[PDB]
């Protein structure tokens with residue numbers, strides 16, 4: 001269950017607005033984001049990942065190597081500098097983003113053709129589920 005390769009289509013998205021509000025994204029743009037169809041495209045080779053989230057108005061890409069800290073500028077989101085680090089905790093892929101916000105990061109659970117994603121910031125957790133296309 002350590003294979004996240006694929007195109008992933010959203011099945012559920014809970015507390016999306018609370019998570020976006022914790023990150024301080026504009027109320028008006030949060031309203032638009034909650035209606036957009038989001039597609040997750042992941043390419044994974046060894047320790048190297050390319051992750052792409054696509055919608056009609058907002059796009060987000062990140063590339064990283066498991067175990068190698070990297071500087072991340074969330075130019076597409078809340079426009080903050082964080083020190084990001086992605087690791088394996090068993091079969092869970094864990095990202096911690098050190099910076100202004102506490103408890104910032106995300107976890108992914110690849111159970112066959114289903115991907116569970118939890119985005120955290122502060123006291124907010126957004127839970128998403130995707131199915132491999």
Ligand SMILES: *C/C=C/c1ccc2c(c1)C(C)(C)c1cc(N(CC)CC)ccc1-2
Nearest residue numbers: 033036038053055058060076077106108
């Ligand atoms: C490993 C998965 C990480 C991941 C999955 C889905 C999204 C993100 C990161 C964000 C934080 C980049 C993000 C932002 C949005 N917005 C509304 C469209 C604001 C740009 C949606 C989905 C994801």
